[PDB]
Amino acid sequence: NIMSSAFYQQIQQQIEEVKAEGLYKSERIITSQQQAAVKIASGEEVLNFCANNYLGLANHPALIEAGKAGMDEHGFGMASVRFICGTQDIHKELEQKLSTFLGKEDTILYTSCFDANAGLFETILDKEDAIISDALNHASIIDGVRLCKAMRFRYSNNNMTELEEQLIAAKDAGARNILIVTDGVFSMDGVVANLPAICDLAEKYGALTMVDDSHAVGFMGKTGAGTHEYHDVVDRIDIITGTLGKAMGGASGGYTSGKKEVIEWLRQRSRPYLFSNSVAPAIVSASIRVLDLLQESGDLRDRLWENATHFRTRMSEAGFTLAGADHAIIPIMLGDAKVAAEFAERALEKGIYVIGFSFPVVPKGQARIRTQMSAAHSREQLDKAIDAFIEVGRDMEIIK
Amino acid sequence: SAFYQQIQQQIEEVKAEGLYKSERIITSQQQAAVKIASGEEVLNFCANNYLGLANHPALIEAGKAGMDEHGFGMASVRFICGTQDIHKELEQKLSTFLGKEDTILYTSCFDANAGLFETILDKEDAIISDALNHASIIDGVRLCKAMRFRYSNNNMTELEEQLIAAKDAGARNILIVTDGVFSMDGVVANLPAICDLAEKYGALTMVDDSHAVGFMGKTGAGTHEYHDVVDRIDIITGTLGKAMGGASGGYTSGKKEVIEWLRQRSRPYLFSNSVAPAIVSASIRVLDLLQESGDLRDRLWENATHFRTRMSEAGFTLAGADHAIIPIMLGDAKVAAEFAERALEKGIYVIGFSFPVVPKGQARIRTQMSAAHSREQLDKAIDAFIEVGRDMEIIK
Secondary structure, eight states: HEEEEEEEEHHHHHHHHHHHHTOOOOOOOOSSOSEEEEEEEEEEEEESSSSSSSSSSSGGGGHHHHHHHHHHOOOOOOOOIIIIOBBHHHHHHHHHHHHHTTTEEEEEEEEHHHHHHHHHHHHHHOOOOOEETTOOOHHHHHHHHHHHSSSSEEEOOOOHHHHHHHHHHHHHHOSSSSEEEEEETTTTTTOOOOOOHHHHHHHTOEEEEEOOOOTTTTTTSSTSSSHHHOOOOOOOOOOOEEEEESSOOOOOOOEEEEHHHHHHHHHHHHHHHHHHEEEEEHHHHHHHHHHHHHHHOOOHHHHHHHHHHHHHHHHHHHHBBOOOOOSSSSEEEEOHHHHHHHHHHHHTTTEEEOEEEEETTTTOEEEEEEEEEESOOHHHHHHHHHHHHHHHHHHHSSEE | OHHHHHHHHHEEEEHTOOOOOOOBBOOSSSEEEBBBBBBEEEESSSSTTTTTTOOOOOHHHHHHHHHHOOSOOOOOOOOIIIIIIHHHHHHHHHHHHHHHHHEEEEEHHHHHHHHHHHOOOTTEEEEEEETTHHHHHHHHHHTTSSSEEEETTOOHHHHHHHHHHHHHOOOEEEEEEEEEEEEEEEEEOOOOHHHHHHHHTTTTTEEEEETTTTTTTTTTTTHHHHOOOOOOOEEEEESSTTOOSSOOOEEEEHHHHHHHHHHOOHHHHSOOOOOOHHHHHHHHHHOOOOHOHHHHHHHHHHHHHHHHHHHHHHHOOBOOOSSOOOOEEEOOOHHHHHHHHHHHHHTTTTOEEOSSSOTOOOEEEEEEEOTSOOHHHHHHHHHHHHHHHHHSSSSS
């Protein structure tokens, strides 16, 4: 164990360095269900303002009942990849309902959106082709691109001038197919990508468009279809990826959605789909339930946006600087990494659970609390959180 | 457009090669007797449902209770607000079951493998792989900047050669990576020989035990238990989606330093949803159930032994040893395809594999044994296989 001990010592020193930078990630143990007021292992009840539980569906009674029913009817697991003996009728039903929900022809299910992105680019593009990425894209997009042999281009976040430049450079380089790839929502900023301008440029230069809409599906756009609906470009986004693990229920599951040809080819060749278990029947059944629950009413979306508007009003009037527009992610900009860490700790002492981010996750000097709104927050819970944030900021001499 | 035309032509080319994958629509639970959309009921001999847990009432009850106590989803990655007490409980129980210090959960073993190598190894290091390793291992290695060496399947001579080559190239850390079971052959990896070579050359060892956890070794802990090298395998990955229940979920298990570093840096763990509480709760139950009774494992190995006896005695050639995967070796791809078609006509659902999945001239039916098969069901399937083999003039 002299070589193995050298290896473990190396890792332990890396861990110690992470702790020294103030960047060590600790897990808070929740003993309750995911919801607005969670219980943690200390015994305290705290208001959760850092979940992707945007419509409060993670503990919604309709989903729990549909998950149980799905287990009674379709069992606990498939124990197979889809093409061997892992496909049930409900997998196809879910894929059809997602396709219509999103305004696309077909949908392919994965056990995560991480895998949907990882399994996309290498399957549809090769060295003859080009991928043009927004510089701020999500890590699963980055890793999918890394498996792909296509030429890679990057444009600065949300910068349509650099996107046009890179489209020209891609044309000049001889690209057969060109794919522009963007997150639909930049999740550290709460900024929705500029889909109209991207679609104009793709149409001008003959490029395909792909949007990862994980942080938008369920509540962006009138019917909650996503940012392509929000920006009225539904038929101009060629490929959409997304997750069931955020607003759409919160368990797990991801998908790719698009033209029948692309989806059929992914079923034939996408490696995560070929080599990983089919999605669990309880999750498939609950997600079918979700899509119906979301077409029944726009009530949950309405509560989400009322909360978001109220939060911006009260927090900005108290003197906080808030990032982004038109999304449930509303970061409190604090600049200094130690200040952000202290703010989160003081918020916890007042019963509010938030998470802070700093470099390298966000730029140096632009540290922030990534507050996330949720339809699960009652107006009183939301006002209690805002009250606590104001008290913390006054205690810390950040606001007057 | 040109792109959609190109894609459609690739599809057509695949259909023309006879390589197109079709999905059979199952309308029942996963079990020995499944119903397909045609309305037929068929005996399923191609699932990874090795202990019949995929529809076991205890898992369904534990999953429902897990939803009542811990909800439907976490809607968060683990480090933000995705960690429940039951996630930590499952990791501790897996750790004790596998004989390792700590365990980190992923939503699939596909992601556990993808999230492993680049997190612990870089260009100064080397990875030495068995040539037959699973695709998620290959894809995890592709994200890793370490030097790559490959040895032919199960070949300890080429492994020693590649260890020497890795030493010669100046490798700082060296990781030998193998599937625990080569899943087209039903062959258990030669862990004793690997560990000897790793000790001799100063290498770490990693085993993907996805096709073994739950039923290999005395407690079902895996191939490291089967080969009595539990403390000599440094890193173990595995899945909950095969013998351990069949829903989804994967994990990496090993020394506390490595697992902690994975929690800090493994990209699928940082950027993908925490595992759904129903699956965590059911898996906690599975780990108790499998130590409470060895009946399911016993039924599995009884079926396996009976299948090998009746099928060898009828004249079939069968691959592997000591595993639930018992391939019928048929050599010729058209013969294997016809065999699967004829078996289906008699109510048995099997899958055949041929090149590029297995070598040319070594096409096979990948029959998978299961505790879910009753003795009567297994005998009906064996009867059908023998009738098919006689109809096809493969056996007398």
